[PDB]
Design a protein around this nucleic acid. Structure first.
Ligand code: ATP
Ligand code: ATP
Ligand code: MG
Ligand code: MG
Lengths: 485, 437, 106
DNA sequence: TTTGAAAAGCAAGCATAAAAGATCTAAACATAAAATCTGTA
């Protein structure tokens, strides 16, 4: 049989097709799923990334500081914690199904608070004030396909591996028809909810409609970017089912960020270390060296980050970058390689904060060649005369030619005109483009300085500035030649 | 350790190929481009260079045959491993299927799996892949060549087999799209008239001498035979270089078309003097010679041209020939003659009823005879046939509804065909355009 | 020196060391002995030949390869496009301009 | 034989239909590995 095409790279999962609704004779024949071995969850890759170390690696004084400020390793989230814990505890205790909506900007401690609520609920269930529950965590951005959530949650409930439609009907039958005394409470965290939004909103409606079912015993904690995500991207059914009591995670104030950073650096700030002067390795309790990071530097970093975002990740990274800058200067001045008072100062914090604020666009255009600068200058002249914000490339060609032939008494132009139009050579004819014309055009397109229209006619194709005009002029005002003309 | 061949007008290009292509992967670029327009000797120079150096391992691929990017990847995967089997037959290998490659990373994985099984070799060698005509791919986009520039970076550095790419390009703008990559490029400028004359002589005199026609016109009626062949090639170039430009292929085709008719006028008097033979066969050097409906349909096409190249306001002046009972004034016609020459522009759009009105105005002709022409079913059948023949076009080309009033009509044929059509039925269509320009 | 002049030309036009390397490599490779290499690096004439070849398929070099009839048709089409407002033309108007030009020449 | 006067032609300007096409999607057509259903055995 001769095949019209071949699919020779098919990788099919071993997932079954029969849903949960057809594996028992009736509703009254379903056994107690709590007393089942595969149901409700009743790591093999960790050995593969281990090797033998044959060098004693030198950890300086700032190494413990930089390891301390990592996001992987709650003074300011106590009302959000109380609200989420009260709602989840009341839904677990009363065998109720509910939705808890949480939204906020990045890094304001939403996932951390939800996980701490879940850990405290598990601690409460361990000592038997609430019935036992299953915890499922589904991130919408960690799914290859959005329907994989259907494959994930059911696999966490029954231990079976099914396809997504069969998993969806299995979850529907489990939430609607299975009695509450026969099942267990399930708390599901939906993280990055905007990634679970499809064109038809099947998954959103299903997940928030299962919470309206009597027998479901399902608690859905939905974590999102904004308050008005259902009112913008979801229908009125899903917006009605999510509810009206929505939990805001506002950005941190500077006191809260300062308290977070001080609670990180609680045991190592204003402390003493044993440091070997020949190598630089530091041991917490040969010179006794006193480590401090100043509270004024942390304070103003907290004030700047809190004014910008309120992001705890940004504040921790600014402090870690300041520690990295101080450690780089320390290892430079002490001659320390890789195998009395050390202070992370305020100037390091201000160097860390300004490094993402300095703009390399003007610095990049300042160090370009003369022909790229001449291109930019001629484009600025065309934008000055005809005022279009989009100039044809042939107009730029004729404006470059005009600027060369008018300032023909300028000494630099007299020295460089043969370079632009003959590459400094006899036996090379007078060219219609300058030397490195498409080179600087593609260079400015690669940098994102310009936008070029997709046309095959080189003259009437238009080119637009992608950056602001005053920084381009500023960069043109630094040069000694283009200032004169 | 490279032999440099001798190409007659490509010395710089051959020296550049000797500079860039070598058996050492340590001093060979990953990518090399040969850019030039058609008939500039790119393929010829590359074949002579690789024939002069048989130690170089080259794989020749033609992307014009492969058409799309997926058969190009599959062809690379097939031909690389076929060349590696025919190069080192004592190496145990696993035959990977070239149809396993549907994506570029699959090509990277397949090439890695092929190349790791040749690590028993002693010296690092180059495998040259010539993509002769990369921008002749019929499914070409701007992002495809970027995937081939960076392909060596995803392959292992310490391999014994080190793949090197040699690209051939036609268009200058396609090459200038990738100028910031700084790929070494050798350019092949177009030949001038003396160069193409010399190339044509030394590439075609050997088979013009040994043609059976030239050896049958002598017997039935070798330096002098070469003189006749070279004089014919020079006469063809002198007559038709203005027509062909500097195209080798067009002059080759003209030599092929005009050689037997030139042989058929060579007598025993014309063989020893070239001027009398040129006067005898003069007609081959003045012209290139490179070439190969019902009455209702013809008048419908003529009426379509009238509807497409006249204005509807002037129709009441040209075709109206009826006696008036109710008092009324006929149209005066256009006031001044414009100079636009409307037959040089694209045709305008007209409706069905204007077409049928002008058609019965121009169609050839007691109380029951009905002199004029009715728009019965065969006129509409002929019009539908004209639309089937693509002699009448619409604004829509697919999912056309013929019955919509928003569908308009235009003629699809030029003037040089309606002149023959109108003179085939003796209609004076040139009078209708004499009132303008 | 000529080498400093070519470095200065690259600095003003390309400011790219791979661009200079792509010309320096066949200067080194095409030399046959030590004295030829020394003369090549003292003169840098191969750099001029390389720069001429890099522009051989541009608009100027493509215009210089045209025949008389091709140049005449191109000038006629450019005349029709300059007279037109959209810069558009076809074969008929360009042939009319060519035919008028040939009658005014003859 | 004139004669004025209404039908008709030309031109500029602006609102607007319409062509051309860029972008995208649904559906027909096509393959294919794992699960599931018959069907004897
Ligand atoms: N209240 C807090 N106390 C201490 N550290 C905190 C606090 N809030 C946030 N952090 C730190 O910031 C990191 C990021 O927080 P988290 O992952 O909870 O953010 P998020 O609000 O869910 O943001 P995103 O929308 O990007 O997912 C945490 O891993 C932790 O290191
Ligand atoms: N320098 C030359 N010396 C001798 N013959 C030549 C020369 N250049 C070209 N020819 C002849 O003309 C033919 C056309 O050359 P070739 O196929 O190399 O052109 P090309 O530039 O690769 O064309 P294309 O882009 O159309 O593939 C050659 O096959 C050969 O017969
Ligand atoms: Mg989070
Ligand atoms: Mg070729």
């Amino acid at each position: 049989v001769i095949r019209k095409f071949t699919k020779k790279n098919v990788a099919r999962a071993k997932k079954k097709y029969t849903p949960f609704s057809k594996r028992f004779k009736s509703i009254a024949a379903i056994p107690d799923l709590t007393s089942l071995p595969e149901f409700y969850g009743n790591s093999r890759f960790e050995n593969k990334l281990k090797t033998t170390q044959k060098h004693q690696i030198v950890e300086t004084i700032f190494s413990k500081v930089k390891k301390q400020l990592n996001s992987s390793y709650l003074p300011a989230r106590e009302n959000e914690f109380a609200s989420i814990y009260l709602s989840a505890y009341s839904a677990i205790e009363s065998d109720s199904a509910t939705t808890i909506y949480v939204a906020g900007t990045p890094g304001v401690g939403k996932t951390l608070t939800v996980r701490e609520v879940v850990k405290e609920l598990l601690s409460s269930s361990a000592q038997r004030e609430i019935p036992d529950f299953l915890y499922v965590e589904i991130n919408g951005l960690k799914m290859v396909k959005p329907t994989d959530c259907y494959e994930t949650l059911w696999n966490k409930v029954s231990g079976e591996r099914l396809t997504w439609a069969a998993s969806m009907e299995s979850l529907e039958f489990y939430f609607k028809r299975v009695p509450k005394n026969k099942k267990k409470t399930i708390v599901v965290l939906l993280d990055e909810l905007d990634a679970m939004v499809t064109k038809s909103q099947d998954i959103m409606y299903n997940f928030f409609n299962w919470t309206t079912y009597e027998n479901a015993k399902l608690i859905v904690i939905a974590v999102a970017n904004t308050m008005d995500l259902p009112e913008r991207q979801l229908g009125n059914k899903i917006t009605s089912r999510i509810g009206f009591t929505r939990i805001m995670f506002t950005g941190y104030t500077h006191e809260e960020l300062k308290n977070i950073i001080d609670l990180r650096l609680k045991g190592l700030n204003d402390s003493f270390f044993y440091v070997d002067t020949k190598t630089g390795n530091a041991i917490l309790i040969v010179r006794k060296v006193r480590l401090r990071m100043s509270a004024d530097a942390i304070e103003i970093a907290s004030r700047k980050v809190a004014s910008v975002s309120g992001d705890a990740r940004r504040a921790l990274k600014v402090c870690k970058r300041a520690a990295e800058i101080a450690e780089k200067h320390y290892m430079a001045k002490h001659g320390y390689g890789y195998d009395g008072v050390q202070t992370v100062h305020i100037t390091h914090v201000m160097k860390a904060l300004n490094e993402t604020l300095n703009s390399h666009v003007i610095t990049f255009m300042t160090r370009l060649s003369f022909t790229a600068k001449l291109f930019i200058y001629a484009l600025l002249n065309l934008m000055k005369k005809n005022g279009s914000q989009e100039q044809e490339l042939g107009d730029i060609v004729d404006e470059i030619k005009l600027l060369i032939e008018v300032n023909g008494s300028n000494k630099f132009v007299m020295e460089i005109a043969k370079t632009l139009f003959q590459q400094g050579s006899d036996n090379i004819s007078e060219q219609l483009r300058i030397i490195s014309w498409d080179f600087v055009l593609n260079q400015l397109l690669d940098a994102g300085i310009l936008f070029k229209q997709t046309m095959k006619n080189d003259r009437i194709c238009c080119v637009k500035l992608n950056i602001s005009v005053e920084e381009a002029k500023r960069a043109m005002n630094e040069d000694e030649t283009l200032r004169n003309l | 350790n490279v032999t440099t061949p001798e190409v007659a007008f490509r010395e710089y290009q051959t020296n550049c190929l000797a500079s860039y292509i070598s058996a050492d992967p340590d001093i060979t670029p990953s990518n090399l481009i040969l850019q030039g327009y058609s008939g500039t000797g790119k393929t010829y120079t590359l074949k002579k260079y690789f024939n002069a150096n048989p130690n170089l391992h080259a794989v020749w691929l033609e992307p014009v045959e492969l058409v799309s990017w997926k058969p190009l990847l599959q062809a690379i995967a097939r031909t690389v491993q076929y060349k590696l089997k025919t190069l080192y037959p004592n190496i145990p290998t696993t035959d990977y299927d070239p149809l396993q490659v549907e994506e570029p990373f699959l090509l990277v994985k397949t090439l890695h799996n092929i190349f790791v099984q040749y690590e028993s070799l002693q010296e690092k060698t180059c495998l040259f892949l010539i993509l002769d005509g990369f921008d002749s791919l019929q499914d070409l986009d701007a992002a495809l060549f970027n995937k081939y520039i960076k392909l060596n970076e995803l392959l292992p550095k310490d391999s014994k087999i080190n793949i090197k790419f040699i690209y051939t390009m036609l268009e200058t703008s396609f090459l200038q799209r990738y100028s910031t990559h700084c790929i070494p490029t050798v350019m092949f400028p177009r030949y001038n008239v003396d160069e193409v004359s010399t190339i044509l002589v030394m590439s075609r005199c050997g088979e013009l001498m040994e043609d059976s026609c030239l050896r049958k016109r002598i017997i039935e009626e070798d330096d002098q035979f070469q003189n006749v062949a070279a004089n014919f090639i020079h006469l063809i170039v002198q007559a038709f270089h203005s027509y062909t430009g500097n195209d080798i292929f067009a002059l080759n085709d003209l030599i092929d078309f005009k050689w037997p008719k030139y042989v058929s006028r060579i007598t025993k008097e014309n063989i020893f003097e070239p001027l009398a033979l040129y006067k005898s066969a003069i007609k081959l050097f003045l012209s290139t010679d490179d070439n190969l409906l019902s009455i209702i349909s013809k008048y419908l096409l003529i009426a379509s041209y009238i509807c497409s190249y006249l204005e509807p306001r002037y129709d009441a002046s040209i075709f109206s020939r009826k006696t008036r009972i109710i008092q009324g004034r006929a149209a005066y016609g256009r006031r001044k003659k414009k100079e636009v020459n409307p037959r040089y522009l694209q045709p305008s759009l007209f409706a069905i009823e204007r077409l049928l009105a002008i058609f019965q105005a121009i169609f050839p002709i007691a109380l029951r005879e009905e002199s004029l022409m009715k728009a019965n079913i065969e006129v509409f059948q002929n019009l539908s046939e004209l639309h089937t023949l693509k002699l009448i076009a619409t604004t829509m080309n697919k999912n056309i509804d013929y019955l919509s009033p928003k569908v308009r009509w235009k003629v699809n044929v030029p003037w040089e065909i309606i002149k023959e059509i109108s003179e085939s039925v003796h209609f004076n269509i040139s009078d209708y355009f004499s009132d303008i320009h | 020196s000529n080498l400093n002049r070519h470095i200065r030309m690259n600095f003003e036009t390309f400011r790219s060391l791979p661009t200079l390397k792509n010309s320096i490599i066949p200067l080194v490779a095409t030399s046959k002995n030590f004295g030829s290499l020394c003369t090549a690096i003292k003169s840098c004439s191969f750099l001029d030949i390389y720069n001429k070849n890099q522009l051989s398929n541009n608009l100027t070099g493509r215009l210089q390869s045209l025949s008389d009839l091709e140049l005449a048709i191109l000038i006629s089409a450019a005349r029709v496009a300059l007279r037109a407002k959209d810069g558009s033309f076809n074969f008929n108007l360009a042939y009319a301009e060519y035919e008028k030009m040939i009658k005014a020449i003859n």
